């Protein structure tokens, strides 16, 4: 769909905060005119759907100050210096929840902020789990929970799983558990 | 127990589009940390279901990711208006359609780590086809999509836009008689 593409004419890093880095670009759009585009430079991420032998999934509660709310989430974290996201996922599953998994399957990649960040999140299904113990980062506060997939889907419908990556995980899990996508 | 207490707030950056809030917070360990996030106006996204069973979707380039995306139409809340008003306006501007039947589905948060953005998702039915009225810097092509085709595209990784993918999943639940 080449007639929709925009051509980068210039880029700069316009701002660096404590955490957020902003790129500002001038682009040539399909009209041949120049427009500004601004977006966050993000390292990428992974998220894991950790399926226990008992059929429950391992989830977390975590407070997110950007939204001033505690969210139910699948474990996740940012990609460290261009590592494969499978490594990110293994590490985050262990650090946030204490689990390791013998069976990892890449499901899909999502883009959560197409208007203003280059973030992508690779979503994985982790099976054949065994437990060790949690190891949280400085400034990271997490409660680990087990959730029945049926209860999770009802929470989705009720608006109680508003975190996009985790809601998408729930729907992919549902497709997997029903044997539709497996 | 997990909640962090705001100690101070500052708008540290305002560009052409993006505004960054930086807060000092006291966390559950009693210690102080910085939190940085985008101040976003909020947004609406619309699933427009045609009488033939297809949905109206768009193709749109997104410079932040350097790809053309398949999306449901959407846009940002203006002057803190009711998001249904946002939805009705953006459905007309981006696709050329109006709808006489609107239903709120759910609110999603696409960037919990670094933006206060929420998106309210709506189902739109009973449609009338007028014409697009695109805004500055907007280039959008309208396409009709069969929901079964949409779900296969999701599986294939060809619907990576979170809001759109979630919309597909909700539509699938509605069309299957599961959620109504």
Residue numbers in the entry:
A (entry chain A): 1 to 182
B (entry chain B): 3 to 182
Give excerpts from the publication.
The B-factor of the E140 Cα in apo Bd-NDPSase is 3.1 times larger than that of G115’ on loop L8, and 1.7 times larger than that of Y19 on loop L1, suggesting that loop L9 intrinsic flexibility facilitates substrate binding followed by E140 mediated nucleophilic attack of the scissile phosphate. A product-release mechanism where an arginine (R37 in Bd-NDPSase) completes a “fence” around the nucleoside is posible, but the presence of a sulfate ion in close proximity (4.5 Å) of R37 in the apo structure precludes this analysis.
